[PDB]
Symmetry: D3
Subunit: 308 residues, 6 copies
C-alpha cells in the first residue's frame, strides 16, 4: 500500500528486524534530543496519505520513549498521515491499571491510553499486555498479540525431558495453565504467597507434585528476577531436574543480572520486545527469541486480513 514504518529510539534493533522481514526499510526521520533533553522530531519524507506504523516499545527510559512516540504521532498527523498505527511491543505502565481500596493512585495505563488517543493514534499493537482489559482502556482498535506460540515452539525445539509447567506466583496461574494445556498437559503448579507473620520471608510452599520433574517456569515478564529465583530454588528443593524460565518481556530493572547469575535456573528464555542491557547481554543463562516475524505478519495483515 502506502505502508511506511518509522522507529523511535526505544527498540531500533527490533524495528529493523520487522523491516527486514517486510522487505522494506525504516522511513527517514530525525528522532533525538535537543541539548536540554526535550525530544526533537522531524519526519524527513512525505507521509501524506500514508498508512504509517510507528514501531516503538514504551520501555526504560519509559517516559522518554513514550514521549518520543507521542510526539512522532503528532508530527505525522499534522503531516497528513492517512492512518497511524502505534506498534508498542512492550506497553509501558501496563501494571498500573486500578485503584485498589480506593488508593489515591493514578491509573497510568489509562492515562497513556488517553494520551495516545488524544495525539491521534488510530490503532495499537502490543504483545502480551499485563492485563488484557487494557484493550478496553482504549477507544480504538487494539491487537494484543500473544508471544506464546514462539515460546512453546522453542520449548518443543529442546523438549528432551519430562516436563511440566509452573506458575511463579498467585497472578500468573491463568497464564501458566494456558501454556500447560497448549503443551501436552500435564501439568500445573503454584507458589506461596505465604505471609504473615514474624519474618517477611519467601518463597514458603509450593502446591503440586514436582518429584524428579524437569520444570518450565513461565510468566508475562521479568523484573528484578527475585520473583523467579525464589521459585526456582523452591522448585529445585523438590528435586526438579532443570528449571527453564520463559517470559515475553525482559525488563530486568534493579539488580536483575546479579539475581540471574546467582539463580538456580538452567536457562532463561525471553522475547526481544525490550533490548537487553550489556550486563544481561554478557550472561550465559539467557537467550532471546525474536517476535520480529510475528510482528511483521501482524503489521502486514493490516494490509488488510484478520488475525489469527
Amino acid at each position: 500500500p502506502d505502508m511506511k514504518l518509522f522507529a523511535g529510539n526505544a527498540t531500533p534493533e527490533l524495528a529493523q528486524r520487522i523491516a527486514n522481514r517486510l522487505y522494506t526499510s525504516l522511513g527517514d526521520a530525525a528522532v533525538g534530543r535537543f541539548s536540554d533533553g526535550e525530544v526533537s522530531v522531524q519526519i524527513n519524507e512525505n507521509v501524506r496519505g500514508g498508512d504509517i506504523f510507528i514501531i516503538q516499545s514504551t520501555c526504560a527510559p519509559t517516559n522518554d520513549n513514550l514521549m518520543e512516540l507521542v510526539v512522532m504521532v503528532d508530527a505525522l498527523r499534522r503531516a497528513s498521515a492517512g492512518r497511524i498505527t502505534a506498534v508498542i511491543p512492550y506497553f509501558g505502565y501496563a501494571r498500573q491499571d486500578r485503584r485498589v481500596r480506593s488508593a489515591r493512585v493514578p491509573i497510568t495505563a489509562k492515562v497513556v491510553a488517553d494520551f495516545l488517543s488524544s495525539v491521534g493514534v488510530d490503532r495499537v499493537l502490543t504483545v502480551d499486555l499485563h492485563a488484557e482489559q487494557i484493550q478496553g482502556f482504549f477507544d480504538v482498535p487494539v491487537d494484543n498479540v500473544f508471544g506464546s506460540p514462539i515460546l512453546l515452539e522453542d520449548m518443543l525445539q529442546l523438549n528432551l525431558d519430562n516436563p511440566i509447567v509452573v506458575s511463579p506466583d498467585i497472578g500468573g496461574v491463568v497464564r501458566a495453565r494456558a501454556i500447560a494445556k497448549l503443551l501436552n498437559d500435564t501439568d500445573m503448579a503454584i507458589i506461596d504467597k505465604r505471609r504473615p507473620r514474624a519474618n517477611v520471608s519467601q518463597v514458603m510452599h509450593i502446591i503440586g507434585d514436582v518429584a524428579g520433574r524437569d520444570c518450565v517456569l513461565v510468566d508475562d515478564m521479568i523484573d528484578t528476577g527475585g520473583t523467579l529465583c525464589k521459585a526456582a530454588e523452591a522448585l529445585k528443593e523438590r528435586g526438579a531436574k532443570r528449571v527453564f524460565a520463559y517470559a515475553t518481556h525482559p525488563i530486568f530493572s534493579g539488580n536483575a543480572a546479579n539475581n540471574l547469575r546467582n539463580s538456580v535456573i538452567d536457562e532463561v528464555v525471553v522475547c526481544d520486545t525490550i533490548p537487553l542491557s550489556d550486563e544481561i547481554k554478557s550472561l550465559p543463562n539467557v537467550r532471546t527469541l525474536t517476535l520480529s516475524g510475528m510482528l511483521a505478519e501482524a503489521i502486514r495483515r493490516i494490509s488488510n486480513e484478520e488475525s489469527i
Copy 2:
C-alpha cells in the same frame, strides 16, 4: 448537604434500605414504561444544585435497568443537578472486558462506561467489580467497594468448625487467597480446569489437603451455579465436612435454583446487590447479608471524607 437519593426499578428494596440507614427517603420520581416498553422518567422534585445519588444495579433486566439509569442521569443533568453519583451495586456487563485472540467481540463494559460518561455521570459506586481494571474504563472517579468485610464477619459469626477457604476455579484464586489471608490463614485450594480430550466432563481434580476440613467456597458471583456445585461435590468427595458457598453477587440465571437445591452445599450466603427471584427466595440453602449499611456509609462519606 443537598444530598438526594433516587432509585430506579433495578434494586428498589436495597435503595430503601440505604435510605433508612441515612435517615432520609427516596426522592419523588416517576420511573416506569410507556405502553410500548420505552422507559418513562420524570423527576418530580427540584434537584437544582443538588448532590444526587442514583441507586440502581444494572442487573437482569439488564438493558432495561441500564437504560433507566442512563435516562435518569440525563433528566437530572438537564434539571441542573449539582453533581450526579451513580451507585451501581452490581455492575452489569462487567465480565465483557477484552477481545481475546482479537475476537470480533464488543468490550461492552467499556461501552457502558462511555455511555455513563456521555450522559453526565460524575462518579460511580459499585461493589466487587469482576475485574478492577474497569475502574480504568471510566474517565471519572470510581469507588469499587469490597463486600468481603461483611462476608468474613458472617463467616466468623458462625465459625464453630475447622475451616479452610477454597477457590471454585482458575480465575478466583486471587480473590480466594485474599480471604484466606484475611481469615487466620490457613488455607488454600484450587480446582480443575482439566480438559482435553474425549469427554467434556468437570470437575476433574482438586489441589490441596481437604481431608476432614469444614470448607468455605468463595467467588465474586454466582451464575447458573454449576461452577460451585461441581466444586462442592468434588470437595465433599474428599471428606469435606460442610461446604459453605459465599459470594457477593447473586445473579442466578438459567436453572440456578434447581442446581442449588440439587447441590451438596450446606449453606449459600450472598449479598443483596441483586434481588433474589421467587424460586431462590423459596429455598432454605440460601441466606442474604445486606450491603445497605456499607453503601450508606460510602455514599455519606461523599459528604465528604475518604475511604477506608
Copy 3:
C-alpha cells in the same frame, strides 16, 4: 464495494428482504443473549476495511434492540470496520425530544443519538422520524427517508372512490396536508382536540366537509390505536364511505389489536419497519407494504450517489 450487511434481532425478516433486493446475504454474526439477559455479540467474519451497514430498528423490545445495535457497532469498530452505517427503519425513543415547561424529563432521543455517536456510528438511515429535527440531534449525516411514496402508490393502486385525506390529530396536520397535496388535492380535515371540562371524552368535533366522502386517514405511526379509532368513528358519523388508515410505523402496543378489530376502519395499511405481532398478524383489517426496496436503494446509493 466492501459492502456488508449485518442484522441484529429487532427486524430480521426485513433485513433479509433488503439483502435479497441487493443480491447479497446477511453477514455471519452471532447475536443473542447470555443466560442472564446480557447481549452476546460476535462478528464471525472479517470486516476489516469494510463499508458495513447494520440493519436494526430500535423497536419493542426497545432497550434490548438498542443495546444489540450499540454493542454490534462497538464490536465492528474494534474490528477495524472501514465505515459503520446504522440503518434504523424505526427510530425508537423518537417521541421524547423536548422538555416542555421545563419538565424534569430526559430528552431520550438525543441520549440515543449521543450513545450512537459515542460508540462510533458514521451515518444513520431511518424512515419517517416523529420530528425531523432529530436529524440535528446527531453530529453525523442522517438520511431520514419518507415512506410516503409507497403509501401513495398503494392508495392509487386501489383508488376507485372519491377520496380525501384526514389528519387524525392536532400534530399530524403537517404530515396530512403534504399527502393531500401529493395526491390530487383536495382535500383536508382536522380533529378535536377538545377538552375542558367535565368529562374527559374524545373525539369531540371535526373540521372540514366529509359528507359522503371515502376517507383516507394518515399518520406517522400507530400506537394503541385509540387515536385512529376515535377519528374513524367520528369520520363515519359524518357519512364517510370507507375509512382507510395509512401509516409507516406499526407499533401496536397495549390492546391495539382489540381496538383495531373493534374499529370501524375498513382497511389499515402499514409499512414493515416493525414486525407485526401474532395478534395483528391474525387480523383481516391489516395489510403491510414493504420498505425493503426503498431501503435497499438508499443503502446501495451509499455506493455512492445522492437521494432523491
Copy 4:
C-alpha cells in the same frame, strides 16, 4: 450570590430592564468593534468565581450578535467565571433545524448550539423557540420560556369583544390551539395552504366559522408580515370585526413595516425580545409588551429555585 449580568449590543435596552427588576446594574465590559469589524471584548471587572449571565439575543445583525456572545463567553471562561448562563431571548437561526428530503443544507441551529457548547456555555435561556426540539440540540440545560402568559394577560386586559383565536398557517396550529385552550376556548381556525397550480396566489381558503367574530391571530414570530396580512384580509373578508395580531418575536425583516401599515390588522402586539426598527417604532398599529419581568424572575430563580 456572585450573580453578574453582562450585555452585548444585540438587546441593550432589554438587558437594562432585566437589570432594573433585579435591582442591580450591567457589569463593566467594553463590547464593540475594531476599525475592521472584528468584535473587541474586554471584561472590565473581576468575574472570578462568579455566576454570570450574558443577556444577548442572536438577532439582526445575527452573526455579529452571535459572535459577540460567543467571544464574551470565551473571555469570561478564561477569566475563571464560576458559571456562564447565556440568555438569548430570541434564538437566531432557530428555523434551520432539519435537512428535508436530504437537502444539502446546514442544520445551523445545531451548529450554533455546538459553537455555544464549545466556547463553554453552562446553560441557556431563550423565549419561545421555533421548535422545542432545539432543547435537544444542546448538551446542557436549556430553559425555553413561554412568552404567552404575558400575551394572554394583555389579551384579557383589552377583552371587550367576542373573541376567537386563529392560526395564521399550517405550522402554528399547535401554538394557536394551546392559546385557544388557555383562553376560554372556543375557538379555532386554520389557513390555506393551497397551491397548485396556475397562479401562485395566497391566501386561498380558511376553515372555521368566523361570521362576526372579533379575531385574535397568534404566531411565534413576525418576519416580512406577508404571512399575517394575507390572513388578516382573509379573516376580514369573513366579517371578522377586529384582527389583533399577537406574537413573541418581532423580526420584521424586508418591507415588514410597509406590509403592516398596508395591513388590515387593527393592532399588532409583540414582546421586546428584539429591538424595533425606527420604521416600526414610528407606527401606530404596533405595541410592545416586556418580557423583562419574566426574564428577571427566570434568571433570579437560578438562585436557585425551579420553574414554574
Copy 5:
C-alpha cells in the same frame, strides 16, 4: 480525484482565479442571506465521497464571512463530503491570540479554530498568519503558506535602484530581516516605538543608515495605513529615494485610502487575499499581485504531494 472547489462570498474573484489555474470551475451552491440576515446555504451538487475545498477568506464582513464558511462546512459534512479543506487566504481574528497581563480578553483566534474543528474541518490553508503559533491553535493539519516568494519576485521585477529592506515596527522585525536575507542582504532598519511622556507623537526615531537609499518597507498586513505612512515620512526625512510598501494582506479599514493618497509612499504592493474596496481600487499608488497560482498549486498538491 473527486476534488471540488466551493466559494462563499468573502473572496469570489480570487476563488474563480484559483479555479481557472486548476482548469475546473466552482461547484454549484447557493450561498446568500435570508431577508433577515441569516446566511442561507444549499450545496446544489453531489459531494458524497468528494475531496472538497472551500475557498473563503474570513475578512470584512468578518463574522458574516466566517459564518458562511462555518455553515458551508456543516452542510458538506452532513452531505457526506469525503474530506473538507478550508482555504482561508486571510485568517480573520488572527491578531487576537493571547491574554496579556491576564486581560479578561477572548483568544478569539483560538475560538475560531475550535469552531472550525467542531463543525468538521479536516485541514486549513491560510497565507501568512499574524503569528505562526496559530497553527497550534488547531488540532488538525494547517499549511500556512508564505506569500513572500511572489513579493520578492515583484521586488526583483522592478529592482533598478539600491535597495534596502525596512521593518515598519517593533513586531515585524522578524518578518523584515527574513526578506532582507532572502534578497541580497544588506540591509535592515527598525522604527520607534518611543513614548513616554508628554505628547503621544509618532514616529520618533529610526535605527539604521538610510542616507540616499531607495527603500522597501514590508509587513504582513496594512490596516488604517497610519503604521506605514508614519514610517514612510520618517524614511523620506533621511533622504530615502523611493519608499515601496509591500505586504500580503490589504485590510484597509478606517480611512486607509485617505492615508495612502496622503502618504509619501511611491508604490504600495499587496496580494489579493482580500478584495480591494472601490476607494483603494481607484488609487494609483496601489497594485495587487495574485496568490491565485500559489493557492492553486498548494490545493492541487493535496492531490497529494508535499510542500515546498
Copy 6:
C-alpha cells in the same frame, strides 16, 4: 479554603518556598520511581473537595518531570479533587509552537497542553512563556506571570551606572524594548543576525550607540549561553562598561557553565524557576532571584481575587 499544595520532584526547593510564604506545608504524597523508571505516585492525604495546586516546572528531566505532573493530576482527579491548578513556573517544550515551511515537526507545546487538558487540569500558572500564544494552546484559563517586576527591582537595587537595555537577538527585541520602557528609557539595541555566506561566524554587527555605556542584556531564558556570550563580547568591543545578563529561566543545557565562566559578562542574574546545577551553583558570575513570593501571591489570589 481547602487549598492544598503538592510538589513533584522538578522544583522541590521552590515549592517549599511558595509554601513558606503561604504559611502552609506541602501535602503528603509519595512521588518517585519504580525500580524500572516508571513514576510511582500516591497521594497520602484526603484531597476530596480540595482546591489543589501542583507546583512542578517541566524542566530537565523534562519528560520525567512532565509525566510526574500528568500522573499526579490523574491521581488527584480520581481522588475527587475539587479543582486542579497546575503551576508550571517553567513550561517545558514551550519553544516548539509552529510548523515553519510546513516542516513535518510536532507542535509539542500544544501536545503537552492537550495532554494536560485530557488528564483534567482546570487552570495553569507559568512564568514568562516563550510565546504568549501558548495561552491559546489551552482550552482552560492560563495565567502567564511576568518575572520582570522582580528583575527590574534588582536592576534598580544595584543601579549605580548609566545604563541601557540590550536585546541579545532578533526575537527578543519585543521583550527588551518593554524593559527599556519600564526602566527610564533610553535605551535600545539589537544584534546580528548576519549570515551569509562563507564562514558561519557570529556575532557580526550591533545596531545602537554603545560608547561607554554600562549595559543590561535581557532575554526570556538562557540555554547553552552562546547566545549571550557572543553578544557580551560584541557589546564590550564597543566600550560597554559592564554587561549584566538578566533572564527568567536558567536552563543551562550543554556546556553553559564553561561558556559563562569563559564569558565577559560581569554578573548573570536569573530567577529560580529552574534549579541550578552544581556547576552553575559553583560559579561567582551567577545570582538567583526568587519568584517564590510572586508565585505565592498568584496562587493565593486564586482565593479568589484577580491579577494585577
